[PDB]
């Protein structure tokens, strides 16, 4: 509960909730199963990309809601990717369309959650295509957001940013 933990570029600190991790096959949006621990349970998080920092809530293979600061759009792009990924949200895995590796050059195993980390920071745009949108909050204390990191009418799916 307490404690500042890190994956990769994203920084957490748990809120509340418990995740019980099981290895499931799971399919991602190349064809390939790979064998994956997944995270079972309602959590919630104070996470962090650099100069952004946000709110994460997640349930089994879902990110249920995002509530971000506004930041250096890089930033909250960056964090917005990092949760996404770190939700085990369906979509994220669905939105791998290109080559990734599980094992480096010399046969060595590598964590297939790290490597989606590294693959969507790098290809963004696979992740954000069929994430989805929904209508923003109106006459709020809340903002909607979309893809580029602007502020619109329609927001990406559970994510939401406080007004400055
Ligand atoms: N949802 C959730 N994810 C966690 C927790 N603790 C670690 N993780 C994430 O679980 C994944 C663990 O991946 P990995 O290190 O490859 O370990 P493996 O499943 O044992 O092979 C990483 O994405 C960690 O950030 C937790 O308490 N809850």
Same mark, same amino acid.
């Given at each position: 509960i307490?404690?500042?933990?890190?994956?990769?570029?994203?920084?957490?600190?748990?809120?509340?909730?418990?995740?019980?991790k099981?290895?499931?096959?799971?399919?991602?949006?190349?064809?390939?199963?790979?064998k994956?621990?997944?995270?079972?349970?309602?959590?919630?998080?104070?996470?962090?990309?650099?100069?952004?920092?946000?709110?994460?809530?997640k349930?089994?293979?879902?990110?249920?809601?995002?509530?971000?600061?506004? %930041?250096?759009? =890089? !930033?909250?792009?960056?964090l917005?990717?990092?949760?996404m /990924?770190?939700?085990? !949200?369906?979509?994220?895995?669905?939105? /791998?369309?290109?080559?990734?590796?599980?094992?480096?050059?010399?046969?060595?195993?590598?964590?297939?959650?790290?490597?989606?980390?590294?693959?969507?920071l790098?290809?963004?745009?696979?992740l954000?295509?069929?994430?989805?949108?929904? =209508?923003?909050?109106?006459?709020?204390?809340?903002?909607?957001?979309?893809?580029?990191?602007? %502020?619109?009418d329609?927001?990406?799916?559970?994510? /939401? /940013?406080?007004?400055?």
């Amino acid at each position: 509960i307490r404690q500042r933990q890190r994956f990769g570029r994203l920084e957490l600190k748990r809120i509340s909730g418990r995740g019980f991790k099981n290895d499931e096959e799971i399919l991602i949006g190349n064809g390939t199963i790979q064998k994956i621990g997944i995270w079972d349970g309602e959590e919630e998080f104070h996470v962090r990309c650099g100069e952004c920092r946000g709110i994460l809530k997640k349930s089994k293979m879902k990110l249920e809601k995002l509530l971000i600061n506004s %930041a250096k759009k =890089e !930033d909250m792009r960056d964090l917005i990717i990092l949760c996404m /990924v770190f939700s085990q !949200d369906t979509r994220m895995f669905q939105g /791998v369309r290109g080559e990734i590796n599980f094992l480096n050059r010399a046969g060595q195993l590598l964590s297939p959650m790290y490597q989606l980390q590294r693959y969507f920071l790098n290809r963004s745009s696979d992740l954000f295509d069929q994430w989805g949108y929904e =209508e923003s909050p109106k006459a709020s204390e809340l903002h909607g957001i979309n893809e580029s990191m602007n %502020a619109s009418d329609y927001t990406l799916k559970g994510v /939401v /940013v406080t007004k400055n």
